[PDB]
Design a protein around this motif. Sequence first.
Motif, mmCIF file in Angstrom:
data_model
loop_
_atom_site.group_PDB
_atom_site.id
_atom_site.type_symbol
_atom_site.label_atom_id
_atom_site.label_comp_id
_atom_site.label_asym_id
_atom_site.label_seq_id
_atom_site.Cartn_x
_atom_site.Cartn_y
_atom_site.Cartn_z
ATOM 1 N N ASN A 103 36.631 7.390 -11.846
ATOM 2 C CA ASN A 103 37.166 7.238 -10.494
ATOM 3 C C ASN A 103 36.148 6.568 -9.588
ATOM 4 O O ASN A 103 36.485 5.645 -8.842
ATOM 5 C CB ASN A 103 37.533 8.595 -9.905
ATOM 6 C CG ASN A 103 38.794 9.167 -10.475
ATOM 7 O OD1 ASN A 103 39.603 8.481 -11.106
ATOM 8 N ND2 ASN A 103 38.966 10.455 -10.260
ATOM 9 N N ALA A 104 34.894 7.027 -9.634
ATOM 10 C CA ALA A 104 33.842 6.375 -8.858
ATOM 11 C C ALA A 104 33.727 4.910 -9.243
ATOM 12 O O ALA A 104 33.579 4.038 -8.381
ATOM 13 C CB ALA A 104 32.502 7.075 -9.081
ATOM 14 N N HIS A 105 33.816 4.617 -10.533
ATOM 15 C CA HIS A 105 33.707 3.248 -11.006
ATOM 16 C C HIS A 105 34.845 2.389 -10.475
ATOM 17 O O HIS A 105 34.623 1.273 -9.977
ATOM 18 C CB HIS A 105 33.714 3.252 -12.537
ATOM 19 C CG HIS A 105 33.437 1.916 -13.138
ATOM 20 N ND1 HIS A 105 34.374 0.911 -13.193
ATOM 21 C CD2 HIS A 105 32.303 1.405 -13.675
ATOM 22 C CE1 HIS A 105 33.836 -0.158 -13.761
ATOM 23 N NE2 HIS A 105 32.580 0.118 -14.059
ATOM 24 N N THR A 106 36.081 2.878 -10.621
ATOM 25 C CA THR A 106 37.247 2.130 -10.177
ATOM 26 C C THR A 106 37.150 1.829 -8.694
ATOM 27 O O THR A 106 37.388 0.699 -8.255
ATOM 28 C CB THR A 106 38.507 2.941 -10.453
ATOM 29 O OG1 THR A 106 38.598 3.175 -11.866
ATOM 30 C CG2 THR A 106 39.749 2.187 -9.971
ATOM 31 N N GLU A 107 36.837 2.843 -7.891
ATOM 32 C CA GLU A 107 36.836 2.647 -6.458
ATOM 33 C C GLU A 107 35.760 1.658 -6.054
ATOM 34 O O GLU A 107 35.991 0.790 -5.213
ATOM 35 C CB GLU A 107 36.633 3.984 -5.761
ATOM 36 C CG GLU A 107 37.151 4.008 -4.336
ATOM 37 C CD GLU A 107 38.656 3.840 -4.205
ATOM 38 O OE1 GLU A 107 39.372 3.915 -5.226
ATOM 39 O OE2 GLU A 107 39.122 3.613 -3.084
ATOM 40 N N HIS A 108 34.586 1.754 -6.671
ATOM 41 C CA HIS A 108 33.524 0.798 -6.400
ATOM 42 C C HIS A 108 33.955 -0.622 -6.765
ATOM 43 O O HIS A 108 33.737 -1.568 -5.995
ATOM 44 C CB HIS A 108 32.258 1.229 -7.147
ATOM 45 C CG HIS A 108 31.102 0.303 -6.951
ATOM 46 N ND1 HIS A 108 30.889 -0.803 -7.748
ATOM 47 C CD2 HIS A 108 30.092 0.318 -6.047
ATOM 48 C CE1 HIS A 108 29.793 -1.425 -7.348
ATOM 49 N NE2 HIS A 108 29.289 -0.760 -6.321
ATOM 50 N N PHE A 109 34.572 -0.794 -7.933
ATOM 51 C CA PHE A 109 34.965 -2.133 -8.345
ATOM 52 C C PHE A 109 35.980 -2.723 -7.382
ATOM 53 O O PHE A 109 35.852 -3.878 -6.953
ATOM 54 C CB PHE A 109 35.526 -2.119 -9.764
ATOM 55 C CG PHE A 109 36.048 -3.449 -10.185
ATOM 56 C CD1 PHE A 109 35.174 -4.464 -10.534
ATOM 57 C CD2 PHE A 109 37.402 -3.719 -10.162
ATOM 58 C CE1 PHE A 109 35.646 -5.707 -10.901
ATOM 59 C CE2 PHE A 109 37.880 -4.971 -10.528
ATOM 60 C CZ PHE A 109 37.001 -5.958 -10.901
ATOM 61 N N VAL A 110 37.001 -1.946 -7.033
ATOM 62 C CA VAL A 110 38.043 -2.458 -6.147
ATOM 63 C C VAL A 110 37.467 -2.779 -4.771
ATOM 64 O O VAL A 110 37.657 -3.875 -4.227
ATOM 65 C CB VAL A 110 39.202 -1.448 -6.065
ATOM 66 C CG1 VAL A 110 40.192 -1.856 -4.974
ATOM 67 C CG2 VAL A 110 39.890 -1.298 -7.424
ATOM 68 N N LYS A 111 36.734 -1.842 -4.194
ATOM 69 C CA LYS A 111 36.310 -1.992 -2.802
ATOM 70 C C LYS A 111 35.165 -2.985 -2.650
ATOM 71 O O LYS A 111 35.112 -3.727 -1.667
ATOM 72 C CB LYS A 111 35.928 -0.631 -2.218
ATOM 73 C CG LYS A 111 37.103 0.333 -2.073
ATOM 74 C CD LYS A 111 38.134 -0.158 -1.080
ATOM 75 C CE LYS A 111 39.325 0.782 -1.068
ATOM 76 N NZ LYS A 111 40.244 0.394 0.030
ATOM 77 N N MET A 112 34.225 -3.009 -3.589
ATOM 78 C CA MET A 112 33.152 -3.992 -3.465
ATOM 79 C C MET A 112 33.646 -5.399 -3.754
ATOM 80 O O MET A 112 33.126 -6.362 -3.179
ATOM 81 C CB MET A 112 31.972 -3.609 -4.350
ATOM 82 C CG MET A 112 31.342 -2.279 -3.966
ATOM 83 S SD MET A 112 30.700 -2.213 -2.268
ATOM 84 C CE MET A 112 29.348 -3.380 -2.386
ATOM 85 N N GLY A 113 34.647 -5.546 -4.624
ATOM 86 C CA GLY A 113 35.258 -6.851 -4.801
ATOM 87 C C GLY A 113 35.813 -7.387 -3.498
ATOM 88 O O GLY A 113 35.606 -8.554 -3.154
#
Length: 86
Positions: A35-45
């Motif tokens: 979950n931390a990974h997904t949110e970071h990928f989406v939001k930092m993109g």
Amino acid sequence: APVTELTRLKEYMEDQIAKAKESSSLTAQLKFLENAHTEHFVKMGSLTTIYKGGSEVVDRLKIEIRSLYEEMLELKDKCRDQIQQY
């Protein structure tokens, strides 16, 4: 709204990383870390598309997020390694 999005992301990642460290099973730990990974990928993109620099508020949050990202990478790798091993 990068400042609010980064505030939410920082605290989301910290919350999920903390819950991963308190989880019993590797499966539950992995779900929080992913979950931390997904949110970071989406939001930092999204951040990369709209922000290049120039805000102290954003820069502080980006540095805080980077530390959480690096911690997440190591915890996620250890968790997945253990899942594969067992």
